Structures are given as C-alpha cells and as structure tokens.
Amino acid sequence: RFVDDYLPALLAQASQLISSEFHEVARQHGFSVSEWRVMASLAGSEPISIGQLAQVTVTKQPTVTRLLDRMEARGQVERLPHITLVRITRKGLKAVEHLMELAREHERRVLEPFGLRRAEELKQTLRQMIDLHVH
Amino acid sequence: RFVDDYLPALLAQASQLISSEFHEVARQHGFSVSEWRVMASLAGSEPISIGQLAQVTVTKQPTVTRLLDRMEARGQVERLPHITLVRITRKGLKAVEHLMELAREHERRVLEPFGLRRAEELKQTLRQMIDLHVH
Ligand SMILES: O=C(O)COc1ccc(Cl)cc1Cl
Numbered sequence: 478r479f480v481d482d483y484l485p486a487l488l489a490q491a492s493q494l495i496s497s498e499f500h501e502v503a504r505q506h507g508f509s510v511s512e513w514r515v516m517a518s519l520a521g522s523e524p525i526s527i528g529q530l531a532q533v534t535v536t537k538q539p540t541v542t543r544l545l546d547r548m549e550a551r552g553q554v555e556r557l558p559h560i561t562l563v564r565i566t567r568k569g570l571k572a573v574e575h576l577m578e579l580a581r582e583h584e585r586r587v588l589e590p591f592g593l594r595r596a597e598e599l600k601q602t603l604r605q606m607i608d609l610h611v612h
Numbered sequence: 613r614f615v616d617d618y619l620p621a622l623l624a625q626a627s628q629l630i631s632s633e634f635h636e637v638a639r640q641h642g643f644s645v646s647e648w649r650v651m652a653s654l655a656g657s658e659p660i661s662i663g664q665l666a667q668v669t670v671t672k673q674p675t676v677t678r679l680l681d682r683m684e685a686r687g688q689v690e691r692l693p694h695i696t697l698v699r700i701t702r703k704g705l706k707a708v709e710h711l712m713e714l715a716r717e718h719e720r721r722v723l724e725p726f727g728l729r730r731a732e733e734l735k736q737t738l739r740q741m742i743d744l745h746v747h
C-alpha cells in the first residue's frame with residue numbers, strides 16, 4: 478500500500494501527531510501555534526529577517542507579518558531596520574521560557590523509546606534534508 | 613539554538629519542504645493537495661472509513677467530507693455503507709496512477725543521497741512514531 482511507505486506521507490503524519498500533542502500544552506499556557514513558533518524560534522537568537530522567521534516557523538510571510546503586528550503590540554517582539562529584522566523582547570522570553578522547558582520534556586518523552594542513537598540519527602537526517610531542500 | 617534541534621520543528625520543516633516540491637508536480641497534473649492525498653491513499657485499497665481516510669490524509673473530517681462530495685460528483689471516488697466507507701473508482705485510479713509513479717521518482721531522488729540504510733531507518737522510525745501516537 479503506497480501511502481504506508483511514502484516518505485512525504487510519513488513525514489506529514491508524524492509531524493501532525495507529535496505537534497498536536499504539544500499544541501494542547503501550548504494552548505493551556507495561552508499560546509496559539511503561530512505565537513509559540515515565533516517566540517520559541519526567536520528565543521536566544523540574534524535578530525533575524527522576516528523571511529528567515531517565515532522559513533523557520535513554516536508560516537507564509539504575509540501571515541507572519543500580521544502576527545508580528547499583534548505580537549509587537551503586546552510587547553513580545555520588536556521589529557527593527559537592518560530588510561526588516563525581528564527579535565524577541567525580554568517580556569516575550571519570560572512569557573515563553575517555561576513552555577520551552579515543557580516542550581523539551583515532551584520531546585524527551587517522544588524520543589525515549591527509540592534510544593539516543595536512533596533519536597540522534599533521526600534529527601541528523603531531518604537537518605540534512607532541510608539543508609538540502611531549503612531555498 | 614532551540615529551534616535548530618527541536619524534533620517537532622525539524623519534522624514540520626522537512627515535511628513542508630519535501631511536500632512543497634511534489635505539490636508543484638501534482639498541480640501541473642491537475643491535482644490539489646487534498647485531491648492527491650485522497651486518491652493516492654485510496655489507490656489499491658479496500659474501502660476504508662471516512663475517519664481512517666481523514667487520519668491517513670492528515671485532513672480534518674468535515675473538510676474530507678466536503679472534498680468527497682465533489683470527488684464523488686466527478687466520479688473519482690465512491691461512498692458506500694458499512695459508518696461510511698469510501699473507495700477509489702477506476703476513473704480515479706486512472707486519473708492518479710501516473711502521478712503516483714512521478715511521486716515515487718521524486719521520493720527516490722529525495723532519499724538517494726542518504727543511502728538505502730539511512731532511508732529505511734528514517735521510514736521505520738517515522739512508522740513506529742506514527743503507530744505510537746495515533747488514536
Ligand atoms: O508547531 C509545531 O509543533 C512544530 O513546528 C515548530 C515548532 C516550534 C518551532 Cl520554534 C518551529 C516550528 Cl516549525
């Protein structure tokens with residue numbers, strides 16, 4: 478059966494199942510999916526361009542720009558001129574840091590049955606595939 | 613940097629990049645993303661329930677039901693009573709079979725740099741993760 482062993486279907490299914498688990502936690506802490514992705518990807522980061530943020534959050538750039546409008550109004554991010562750069566503020570970092578700890582715990586739980594070797598292999602393969610296909 | 617080594621972000625990014633590549637081909641052959649997922653997941657399948665189809669196509673069930681309304685009007689799928697089951701028709705199979713060959717070729721190209729061992733390891737890990745987290 479094709480779908481059972483077709484890589485893009487496996488990636489899409491695994492991604493949605495794991496993400497859906499953590500999105501429940503994120504919402505219980507006041508975060509939408511997009512807010513979580515933006516703050517977690519900016520935490521501990523130099524300012525990056527709106528285009529880089531859209532890439533790493535897997536979000537269309539027009540959508541990211543409207544999201545940053547409201548996140549900047551809430552004091553959680555700041556846009557700055559170099560192209561437009563964006564950074565997390567201290568308020569945003571304090572808003573997200575506990576949730577990031579919870580995300581690490583959940584990821585640990587997802588990966589523990591597989592063992593350190595298989596978990597690192599998976600992450601390295603995914604990183605290599607991303608770097609080969611990103612524009 | 614958190615996002616660089618956080619499994620759900622890696623899965624979401626790799627999934628979107630690989631899928632976006634094949635979706636260009638699919639549209640050039642007349643298929644939307646959802647139409648492609650439905651027909652490719654039903655090809656060579658016993659009839660399955662709408663809920664199973666929603667799961668394997670990573671699509672919300674209300675959306676799948678409206679999609680099947682129009683795909684059934686086009687003669688490409690058929691809904692049948694057991695719960696509602698759904699199957700691909702011969703017309704649908706003939707519509708999608710070439711695109712499935714192209715999808716296999718694209719997947720081969722994505723996986724070839726990694727070698728057979730790493731490619732099979734990735735697919736087995738993804739399958740195991742899906743089976744551990746699906747409801
Ligand atoms: O939403 C999810 O569960 C996975 O996607 C992400 C999660 C965290 C970050 Cl920082 C970036 C992305 Cl794309």
Ligand SMILES: O=C(O)COc1ccc(Cl)cc1Cl
Pocket residue numbers: 480483485486489490630631632634635645648649650652653668669670
């Ligand atoms: O759309 C994509 O590129 C990947 O998602 C799929 C692809 C094919 C099938 Cl059959 C099922 C799914 Cl979820």
